[PDB]
Every structure is written in C-alpha cells, then in structure tokens.
RNA sequence: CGCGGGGUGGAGCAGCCUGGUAGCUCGUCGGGCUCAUAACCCGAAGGUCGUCGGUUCAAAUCCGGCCCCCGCAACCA
RNA sequence: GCCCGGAUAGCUCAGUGGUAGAGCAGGGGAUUGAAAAUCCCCGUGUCCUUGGUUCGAUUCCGAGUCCGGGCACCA
RNA sequence: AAAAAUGUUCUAA
RNA sequence: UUCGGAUUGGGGUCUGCAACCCGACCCCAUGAAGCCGGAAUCGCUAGUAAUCGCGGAUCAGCCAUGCCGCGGUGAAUACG
C-alpha cells in the first residue's frame, strides 16, 4: 500500500516504504 | 623417507625436487641451495651424502614443514571457527572465505553440482 | 491384552487342575489381595476386565499388581466342523489358577477403597474369591 | 600462463611489477 | 529521491570520499563526463544542436 | 484353520525355481532443438523387495506365523 | 439380535505415537492491456463421544452414538 | 518430385 | 609436470574518515578441477579470422577478464 513494486495488495501501490 | 619425511624424486634437479615437500615452493629451494653451497642443477641422485646431510639439516630447521605446517594451518582454521568470526562460519559451511560470489561459481569450495528441480513454466493452455 | 511375546511351541495340551496353587500364595507387594477359592483357567479377557474395574474404582489412583499371567494358549475349532483333521487354532490365552493363588494386589489406597475394588474385581471372575490383607504370615515367607 | 601472478607473464597481464617482473 | 540529491551533491561533504559528479543539466548520477559536467545523454543532446564549442560527430 | 495364486523404484512387468547380482518399458528431474508446446536427442535420480520369526558365513530368493489383494470351490441328499 | 466399514478445515478427502495435511471455495502477489492457466502467500480445525495402554494418542486397543450395509428354511 | 502434430479468452490499436 | 593457477594459511603495501560484511596490489606457503569437452552450438571472405601487447572514458581506490579505440604478426577456403 506504499511505493513501488511488488504490489502490496492495494491498487497501484507497492510494498516499499520510504 | 630422506627429507624431511619426503623422499624427493631422484632424476630431477635439486631445486625442483625440493618443491615436492609440503612447505617449499620454488623460492625457498633457491635459498637452501645458495645458503648451503649445492649446485641448483644437480640431479638428486647425484648429491654427495655430504650435500644430502648438509641440505637436510638446513631445510629441516630453517622453516617448519610437512606435518607441522599442516598442523599450524589446521590450528588457525580451528581458531577462527571457535571464536565464531565471519571467516569461521564460511569454513563451517564450507563456502568461500575471501569474498567471492556464491550465486554462480565456487565449485572448488562447494563441490560437485547438486542439481535440483526448477520452477516450472506454465502450460499453454 | 496380555499374552506371551514369543513361544517355543504354539499349542499346548489341556492341563489338569489338581491341588493347591504351586506358589504365589502370599501377599507380595501390596496391602490387599484377591485369592482364588476354586481352580480355573482365567482368560486374558477376564484378567483385563478385573484390572479396568479396579482402575476406574481408584479413578487412576493407587497401584495395581497383576500376579497371574495368561501364558497358556487356548485352542478352538471353527464353528460347525466335525472332529479330526488336527487340533484347532489358538484363539486366546489363559492363566491356570489353583486355590490359594493371590491373583491381584492393590496398594496405596484406603482399606475401604481396596475392599470395594477387589469385590468388583471378583464379579468379573468365574470363580469364588476372597479378599485378604497382608499379615505377618505373608512377611514371614 | 597469464593467470599466474608469480611470473613475468602474469605481471604483464595484471599490469603490475615486482620481484617476478621488476622495472 | 531526485531534488534533495541534486542539492546534496553540491554541499561540501563530511568527507572527501563522499564527493560525486552529477549532470549539471539533468541531474544524472551515472555516465557524467568531467570535461563537460554533463551526462552522456545531455552531451549528445547539446552536441547535435551545436551548442558545444568545437565538438563534432567524429568519423574515420 | 476348504483349495490356489499374489505383495519388489511413482505405474505395469523380470529377478525367486537354482542363496552372494536388483533388471526392462513408461514416468519424474537436469540440459539440448523450436518463436513456443508436443514428438525427438543427450545426461541423472529414485526400490534396503508386505510383515514378524527362523535357517545360513550371507535371505527379495529357502522354511514357518501374521496382515493384506485377486481367483477357484461348496457335491449325494 | 449379531457381524463389517465410515466420522479430520466452509465442501470433497489424505494421513502413520509427539495436536496435522492437501485439493476445491475466497483474497492478495507474480504474470497480463485485462483475463484464463501456471507458480507463491494468507485465514481455515476441540480430528464424532467415552474408557484403556502410554511421559505423551487424531494415530495403537475396547465400547458408545449416528450413518452406511451383511446373516439365513426346506425336502 | 512433399518425413514432422499443435498455438487458451476478449481486444487490432 | 618447471603444464594450470583455482582454493586456503601467514605476512605486508596503498587509496580512503573507514577495506568485518565487501577493495586492488605485493611476497612466503599452499598448488584444486582441468588430458581438448554429450546432445547441441557461434564468429569470420583479407591486412579479415587467429594470436600479441598498448591506450582512454568512468575513477580516491577498485572487484575491467567489460566497453570504445590503437597498431604488431598474419593465414585457410568459397566448387557451387
Ligand atoms: K444320488
Ligand atoms: Mg523480488
Ligand atoms: Mg526516503
Ligand atoms: Mg611444495
Ligand atoms: Mg559474496
Ligand atoms: Mg489444463
Ligand atoms: Mg485333552
Ligand atoms: Mg493335600
Ligand atoms: Mg495357582
Ligand atoms: Mg517358593
Ligand atoms: Mg473358557
Ligand atoms: Mg481348548
Ligand atoms: Mg482334532
Ligand atoms: Mg482345539
Ligand atoms: Mg465371581
Ligand atoms: Mg477384612
Ligand atoms: Mg565516489
Ligand atoms: Mg558520477
Ligand atoms: Mg510398490
Ligand atoms: Mg517384462
Ligand atoms: Mg523364476
Ligand atoms: Mg540366483
Ligand atoms: Mg532398474
Ligand atoms: Mg524435461
Ligand atoms: Mg513476438
Ligand atoms: Mg520442447
Ligand atoms: Mg513371508
Ligand atoms: Mg531373514
Ligand atoms: Mg536373515
Ligand atoms: Mg541378496
Ligand atoms: Mg454325482
Ligand atoms: Mg435376538
Ligand atoms: Mg462399530
Ligand atoms: Mg487469483
Ligand atoms: Mg501480498
Ligand atoms: Mg501492471
Ligand atoms: Mg492485476
Ligand atoms: Mg477411541
Ligand atoms: Mg483406531
Ligand atoms: Mg512425404
Ligand atoms: Mg490439442
Ligand atoms: Mg605446477
Ligand atoms: Mg609455472
Ligand atoms: Mg590471508
Ligand atoms: Mg572492503
Ligand atoms: Mg599431457
Ligand atoms: Mg575445441
Ligand atoms: Mg561480407
Ligand atoms: Mg595465449
Ligand atoms: Mg585496457
Ligand atoms: Mg579507474
Ligand atoms: Mg570480488
Ligand atoms: Zn544529463
């Protein structure tokens, strides 16, 4: 639900956090 | 069983036969022969037992060798695994020690290839 | 259920049941015992029925000693066959038990608790029995 | 051979100098 | 991580070793030519415009 | 506890008779060819032989008991 | 009345003494333009009750309940 | 005068 | 094997605030696999291929055996 790939299950958003 | 425990091959020059002793590469053979006055080019079967006992004495005492060197090498590796340092763990797991890649190489350190199954490609359809 | 792990021979001839028990006639381990008054072949099934009755009467408490062992193979022909053609097949195991044998003992339990448990135990058995407590005669042996 | 650091050949390869190839 | 790294490369660092080039045109960290202060792309862009003194597509 | 046969890589079959040896086809795994799959070609792995007991220097193989799986039989009344 | 067999996740079923798997259903990731398929990850449970053996039992032994079935004129 | 099978759904920009 | 120089022990040097993870280099010692490579498969028609070394960009250093260039030596064969 955060920045880039892979996806965290929310649309558009990924697992990487800042 | 001449020197030290090693029967160094006759029919070869001294400087080379000496290398057949665990602990003596080409450079140390250059010393012992200079430091004891034997021709580096004399075939081993052609050494006077004066030269033999001369060379044997210096070789056997200047540096440490076949079985003792092996034991000091062993104690150092043994030491690293005991303290539990990084090089120690890489000796336990039998992996490379000097920072090589292990993704794709290291067969000297790892052994023959233990091939396992791979991820399957999907079928069509 | 009890039975021998191994046997030298599979089938045994039928016994005789003469005389008082050979040994095991005195309380050996516990405080109270159950004594045979008649001879019989006691079955593995009967022995296990007496044991579980006492176990549930102690609600797992106390100790139980089985001082008989069904080592004797008990043979039986299939139903509706004629005589002959060799001996029937082993169908279970019995313990030979002559009068005066201490078959069971209990310990670590109230007298009242032992008495009841040995009474119930006795109702599983095909012989008259007796309850006993360990006297000095038992300790003299 | 070129992988042998201990020769005038291997120092020519790794572009280094030393006892085994001085200057 | 773009603009705050455009700035950071300018700042004089806590240590000499932490210095690094960036394209002064686009900000690229990689393929930065010292002579121009430019990455290999901006180089090819400004070149083809003739905005780069004396630079000319070589051939031989 | 009528008689007969069977139990061995994942599947289907050899090996047993005649004690010292595990074999064949498919299948599985790795690599080739193909744009790609299949066919095809090159390699590899996997069975202590239903089970317990005995005989033997040695048991899948010989002998007993147990489990299981097919088959056959049950006539005169 | 007596004999055999079944009971484990929401559903269909594996499992041979140290409380456990699968498939399928649903969701997410990878993959895709988006799907199908394939691969990964996630939630699933007093393993029907009761007694016993055991340090320990879904697992071995007995019973019970429910279901599912089996007995056999006679000349 | 031809060894050799096949290419999931919707979309064709 | 005076072929090969991987791996490991020890001892140094340098760059760098700093080389445990994770640098290059030096010297002692160690001295693996490898005896020309299954099915299969790539490049090149001439100063080419093959073989030899040199330089530069990046860059403190460097994991470059990579890349872009440079000249030395210099073939084989094309019937169709
Ligand atoms: K008749
Ligand atoms: Mg990833
Ligand atoms: Mg951040
Ligand atoms: Mg040596
Ligand atoms: Mg590494
Ligand atoms: Mg399908
Ligand atoms: Mg009799
Ligand atoms: Mg008398
Ligand atoms: Mg008696
Ligand atoms: Mg006595
Ligand atoms: Mg009876
Ligand atoms: Mg009888
Ligand atoms: Mg008889
Ligand atoms: Mg009988
Ligand atoms: Mg009675
Ligand atoms: Mg009394
Ligand atoms: Mg830098
Ligand atoms: Mg830069
Ligand atoms: Mg089988
Ligand atoms: Mg066959
Ligand atoms: Mg045969
Ligand atoms: Mg044979
Ligand atoms: Mg075979
Ligand atoms: Mg394959
Ligand atoms: Mg295409
Ligand atoms: Mg294919
Ligand atoms: Mg048998
Ligand atoms: Mg045997
Ligand atoms: Mg045997
Ligand atoms: Mg054999
Ligand atoms: Mg007739
Ligand atoms: Mg009835
Ligand atoms: Mg039942
Ligand atoms: Mg899905
Ligand atoms: Mg996820
Ligand atoms: Mg996408
Ligand atoms: Mg999607
Ligand atoms: Mg039960
Ligand atoms: Mg059971
Ligand atoms: Mg044809
Ligand atoms: Mg088809
Ligand atoms: Mg050598
Ligand atoms: Mg050499
Ligand atoms: Mg070292
Ligand atoms: Mg480092
Ligand atoms: Mg050779
Ligand atoms: Mg070749
Ligand atoms: Mg051409
Ligand atoms: Mg060469
Ligand atoms: Mg260069
Ligand atoms: Mg550099
Ligand atoms: Mg490295
Ligand atoms: Zn730029």
Curated annotation (Swiss-Prot), chain B:
Span of the signal peptide: none
Cellular component, GO annotation: cytosol; small ribosomal subunit
Top-level taxon in the UniProt lineage: Bacteria
InterPro entries xrefs: Rbsml_uS13_C, Ribosomal_uS13, Ribosomal_uS13-like_H2TH, Ribosomal_uS13_bac-type, Ribosomal_uS13_CS
BP GO terms, sorted: translation
Keywords: Ribonucleoprotein, Ribosomal protein, RNA-binding, rRNA-binding, tRNA-binding
Pfam hit, one: Ribosomal_S13
GO terms of molecular function: rRNA binding; structural constituent of ribosome; tRNA binding
Region of interest (Disordered), ranges: 94-125
Subunit structure: Part of the 30S ribosomal subunit. Forms a loose heterodimer with protein S19. Forms two bridges to the 50S subunit in the 70S ribosome, contacting protein L5 and the 23S rRNA; these bridges are straddled by the 5S rRNA.
Primary role: Located at the top of the head of the 30S subunit, it contacts several helices of the 16S rRNA. In the 70S ribosome structure it contacts the 23S rRNA (bridge B1a) and protein L5 of the 50S subunit (bridge B1b), connecting the top of the two subunits; these bridges are in contact with the A site and P site tRNAs respectively and are implicated in movement during ribosome translocation. Separately contacts the tRNAs in the A and P sites.
Stated family: Belongs to the universal ribosomal protein uS13 family.
The protein's name: Small ribosomal subunit protein uS13
Source organism: Thermus thermophilus (strain ATCC 27634 / DSM 579 / HB8)
From Swiss-Prot, chain C:
Disulfide links within the chain: none
GO biological process: translation
Pfam families, sorted: Ribosomal_L16
Keyword NAD tagged: no
SUPFAM superfamilies named in the record: Ribosomal protein L16p/L10e (SSF54686)
Stated role: This protein binds directly to 23S rRNA. Interacts with the A site tRNA.
Entries under HAMAP family matching the protein: Ribosomal_uL16
Subunit field text: Part of the 50S ribosomal subunit.
Matches recorded under PANTHER family: 50S/60S RIBOSOMAL PROTEIN L16, LARGE RIBOSOMAL SUBUNIT PROTEIN UL16M
Family under the similarity heading: Belongs to the universal ribosomal protein uL16 family.
Listed name of the protein: Large ribosomal subunit protein uL16
Curated annotation (Swiss-Prot), chain D:
Annotated stretches, region: Disordered: 1-23
Signal peptide span: none
Highest taxon of source: Bacteria
GO cellular component, one term: ribosome
Basic residues: bias regions: 1-12
InterPro entries: Ribosomal_bTHX, Ribosomal_bTHX/bTHXc/bTHXm
Keywords annotated in UniProt: Ribonucleoprotein, Ribosomal protein, RNA-binding, rRNA-binding
GO molecular function, one term: rRNA binding
NCBIfam families, per database record: PRK14753.1, ribo_THX
Free-text function comment from the UniProt entry: Binds at the top of the head of the 30S subunit. It stabilizes a number of different RNA elements and thus is important for subunit structure.
Family designation: Belongs to the bacterial ribosomal protein bTHX family.
Subunit architecture: Part of the 30S ribosomal subunit.
Record protein name field: Small ribosomal subunit protein bTHX
Species whose genome carries this gene: Thermus thermophilus (strain ATCC 27634 / DSM 579 / HB8)
Organism classification: Bacteria, Thermotogati, Deinococcota, Deinococci, Thermales
Swiss-Prot record, chain E:
Entry GO terms, CC: cytoplasm; small ribosomal subunit
Gene Ontology biological process terms, A to Z: translation
Cofactor(s) needed by this chain: Zn(2+)
Keywords assigned by UniProt, alphabetized: Metal-binding, Ribonucleoprotein, Ribosomal protein, RNA-binding, rRNA-binding, Zinc
Coiled-coil residue spans: none
Molecular function in Gene Ontology: rRNA binding; structural constituent of ribosome; zinc ion binding
InterPro entries assigned to the protein according to its UniProt record, in alphabetical order: Ribosomal_uS14, Ribosomal_uS14_bact, Ribosomal_uS14_CS, Ribosomal_uS14_sf
Reported function: Required for the assembly of 30S particles and may also be responsible for determining the conformation of the 16S rRNA at the A site. Binds 16S rRNA in center of the 30S subunit head.
NCBIfam families in the cross-refs: PRK08061.1 (NF005974)
Assembly behavior: Part of the 30S ribosomal subunit. Forms a tight complex with proteins S3 and S10, which cover it.
Protein name: Small ribosomal subunit protein uS14
Species name: Thermus thermophilus (strain ATCC 27634 / DSM 579 / HB8)
């Amino acid at each position: 639900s955060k920045k880039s790939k892979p996806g965290d299950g929310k649309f558009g958003r990924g697992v990487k956090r800042g | 069983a001449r020197i030290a425990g090693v029967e160094i091959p006759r029919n070869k020059r001294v400087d080379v036969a000496l290398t057949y002793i665990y602990g003596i590469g080409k450079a140390r053979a250059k010393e012992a022969l200079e430091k004891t006055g034997i021709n580096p080019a004399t075939r081993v079967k052609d050494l006077t037992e004066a030269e033999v006992v001369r060379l044997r004495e210096y070789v056997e005492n200047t540096w440490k060798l076949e079985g003792e060197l092996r034991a000091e090498v062993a104690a150092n590796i043994k030491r690293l695994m005991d303290i539990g340092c990084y090089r120690g763990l890489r000796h336990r797991r039998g992996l490379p020690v000097r920072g090589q890649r292990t993704r794709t190489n290291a067969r000297t350190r790892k052994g023959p290839r233990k091939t396992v199954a791979g991820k399957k490609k999907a079928p069509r359809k | 259920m009890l039975m021998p792990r191994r046997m030298k021979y599979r089938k045994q001839q039928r016994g005789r049941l003469k005389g008082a028990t050979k040994g095991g006639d005195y309380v050996a381990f516990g405080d109270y015992g159950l004594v045979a008054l008649e001879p019989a072949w006691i079955t593995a099934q009967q022995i296990e029925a007496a044991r579980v009755a006492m176990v549930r009467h102690f609600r797992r408490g106390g100790k139980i000693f089985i001082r008989i062992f069904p080592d004797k193979p008990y043979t039986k022909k299939p139903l509706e066959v004629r005589m002959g053609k060799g001996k029937g097949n082993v169908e279970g195991y019995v313990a030979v038990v002559k009068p005066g044998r201490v078959m069971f003992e209990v310990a670590g339990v109230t007298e009242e608790q032992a008495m009841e448990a040995l009474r119930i135990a006795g109702h599983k058995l095909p012989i008259k029995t007796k309850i006993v407590r360990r006297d000095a005669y038992d300790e003299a042996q | 051979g070129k992988g042998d650091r201990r020769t005038r050949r291997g120092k020519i390869w790794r572009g280094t100098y030393g006892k085994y190839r001085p200057r | 991580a773009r603009k705050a790294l455009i700035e950071k490369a300018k700042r004089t660092p806590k240590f000499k070793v932490r210095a690094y080039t960036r394209c002064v045109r686009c900000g690229r960290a990689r393929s930065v030519y010292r002579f121009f202060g430019l990455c290999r792309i901006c180089l090819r862009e400004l070149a083809h415009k003739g905005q780069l003194p004396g630079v000319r597509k070589a051939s031989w």
